[PDB]
Write a protein that binds this ligand. Structure first.
Ligand SMILES: Cc1ncc(COP(=O)(O)O)c(CNCC(=O)O)c1O
Ligand SMILES: Cc1ncc(COP(=O)(O)O)c(CNCC(=O)O)c1O
Lengths: 405, 405
């Protein structure tokens, strides 16, 4: 940086602390990643200065000729990546992508069927303190009590009973592949639209490591910043028949001017995802998650669903008589970042929980491989099995430091 | 830039075209400005990699110690700038800032009183194709047919008749000072909350050139990117009594993870606004707008309300028998960017209009002064009075080029 250090010493010092923090810790928050320098340069561009309400070639402001090229590059690269008939790259976030789809097909008070929030569903999938739960009537389907895999018979029974206008599939903490074909079969049975929120697994979908929801869902929402490794923001994919309605839901519906600099960064991230090395990266993400899962099971940990098919895993800490809150706090003391997370049928509240959620997308981006996954598991074993030992915690800190340099 | 040019030639070429375009044209879109290099550096930082749902010291993710400092710097600088009891610097945009306030105090279907959209009110102030108009019952107050100044007796009559739960004051195209004291007096008469959307005039408010709505309104919303000259995004200011509710409206209410890199850029822009030179800049904005207004009147143009008290002006093109659409198109041919804009009591639809909206915040930022305002007016006079003359248009292009270098 050059102008920030002189203009704003306070902001620059905080940013520099954060940059160093990102290098020194072992980041296992399943929804995070590290973007490239090219993506950051695109978001640090002069495109923030442009008002561009409307869409390419149909704007409400003159002078959009070059930001129109950037938005089209994002839309076309997105379509090549996922094979959707239409893309909307303006959503400011995953929450706004979901909000616009709901605004498109639902009336206030309509019934929506989504994944139980304590079994893996996201906050925007019906939480009562979120707009989704306040605006609409959400009902939930759950996972089997023993396998922790979505119970498709429960999806079907709830759909037939409650007759939702929309069914939402996908999650913030589900470690197994989701069967979009079964979701669409159920939606067709009850005449409901199907929305797939692939935010967590978009990068895996793009690399062919997770079944693509596009061919099965009427609408596909996502964030661009998790496994897709892009700038922070959202995107909506949909069939051509809902294109005009989805575009109008975003604008003039729920947003105003789009973040053109962020859309440029989205295009950049999509170009990166279209390359062969991104496909190799994604395979390493899933391979690392499987390895990490196995290594944790080797340490004596119980995993929700018995392992993982994607980038994330959930540890059920009941066997160690620990809450997720306790485990997150002690791991933070040694330099490992995880988040507490409810497990299916959790006896504890969502503010305490009986689990921790872990993902490998970020450590994979920094170059960690299978041997590092074994060591991370061994460090987590040392800490969680010896929470009252300061010597074990100090050893863990030195082992974390050895991994991050 | 260094990594973008090699990684993505297509995106870099489009951005570079846009950067050069910003220099070569005379930008008079009232809602635009040019941010500093320090602000862009903050948005191009590694802070995009951090999930930070929740607020400083009360996050739902560990590792937020340094992004907490950045958010607090933004909130505290905002409070010093505007004197509000509380600030929320997470809104992704002006639309999301407004959406969260509405989510805080209104139930679906509640009555809201806002400025007539064809007299200056914004799209998020009740348009029927926007969430505001779909979710709530908007009624409107207008400006006097001759003076084009808000008719406060009409505000009061509509409030007493319709008994709104909320009254919204402020606009996207009102060239005169708004009397927040009268708005609060009316709101108190009918027991309504008062919300002031100061997006367009925030920078003028911060420099003491427009009365501050903070002491009169329960809620103040704004964008950070117009006269405030910050990154693209929103902010909510409010009294301490609504602080917890407003914070919960933003999260877990209507958004998810905030854009921490953009919040860092907001803090940077707020630090710039707290400096004496920003106060001198803002005075030049208003001085330039007055000068430009007078110079246009000297060319024979009629201005809505007869001039301006702020950064923007509206030309009523009926005397020249031109629509705003026609004037915007021909000015685009010579390198001058304006937007068509309905005028009060406009006989034409909002897609054609009888006016153009012009603002001086951007040309002031690039260093234009009073002499440049006279020349811009003289160029607009030459073009609009000679729309069928290609020689007049070519002369205008050379004069525009002389101003931008
Ligand atoms: C499945 C899923 N959907 C939407 C969001 C919201 O995105 P945002 O950009 O934060 O508004 C999320 C976010 N999850 C954060 C977390 O999982 O850590 C999500 O998972
Ligand atoms: C008064 C007023 N309020 C909210 C917005 C919305 O902001 P955004 O960041 O675009 O969601 C605006 C925007 N106006 C754009 C225009 O005036 O050109 C506004 O004016």
């Amino acid at each position: 940086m050059k102008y920030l250090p002189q203009q704003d010493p306070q902001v620059f010092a905080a940013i520099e602390q954060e940059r160093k923090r990102q290098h020194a810790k072992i980041e296992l928050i399943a929804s995070e990643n590290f973007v490239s320098r090219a993506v950051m340069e695109a978001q640090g561009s002069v495109l923030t200065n442009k008002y561009a309400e409307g869409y390419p070639g149909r704007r409400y402001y003159g002078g959009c000729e070059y930001v129109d090229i950037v938005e089209e590059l994002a839309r076309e690269r997105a379509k090549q990546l996922f094979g959707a008939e239409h893309a909307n790259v303006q959503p400011h976030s995953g929450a706004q992508a979901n909000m616009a789809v709901y605004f498109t097909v639902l009336e206030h008070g309509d019934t929506v069927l989504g994944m139980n929030l304590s079994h893996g569903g996201h906050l925007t999938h019906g939480s009562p303190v979120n707009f989704s739960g306040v605006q609409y009537n959400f009902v939930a389907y759950g996972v089997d009590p023993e396998t922790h895999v979505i119970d498709y018979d429960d999806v079907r029974e709830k759909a037939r009973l409650h007759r939702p206008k929309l069914i939402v599939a996908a999650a913030s903490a589900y470690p197994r592949i989701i069967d979009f074909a079964k979701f669409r079969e159920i939606a067709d049975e009850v005449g409901a639209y199907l929305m797939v929120d692939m935010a967590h697994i978009a990068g895996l979908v793009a690399a062919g490591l997770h079944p693509n929801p596009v061919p099965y869902a009427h609408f596909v929402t996502t964030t661009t910043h998790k496994t897709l490794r892009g700038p922070r923001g959202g995107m909506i994919l949909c069939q051509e028949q809902f294109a005009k309605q989805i575009d109008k839901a975003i604008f003039p519906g729920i947003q105003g001017g789009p973040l053109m600099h962020v859309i440029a960064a989205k295009a950049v991230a999509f170009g990166e995802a279209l390359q062969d090395d991104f496909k190799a990266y994604a395979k390493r993400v899933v391979d690392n998650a499987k390895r990490l899962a196995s290594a944790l099971q080797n340490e004596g940990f119980t995993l929700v669903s018995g392992g993982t098919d994607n980038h994330l895993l959930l540890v059920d800490l009941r066997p160690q008589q620990l809450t997720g809150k306790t485990a997150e706090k002690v791991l933070d003391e040694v330099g490992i970042t995880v988040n507490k997370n409810t497990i299916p049928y959790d006896p504890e509240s969502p503010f305490v929980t009986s689990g921790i959620r872990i993902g490998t997308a970020a450590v994979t981006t920094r170059g960690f491989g299978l041997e590092e996954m074994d060591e991370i598991a061994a460090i987590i074993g040392l800490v969680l099995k010896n929470v009252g030992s300061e010597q074990a915690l100090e050893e863990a800190r030195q082992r974390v430091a050895a991994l991050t340099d």
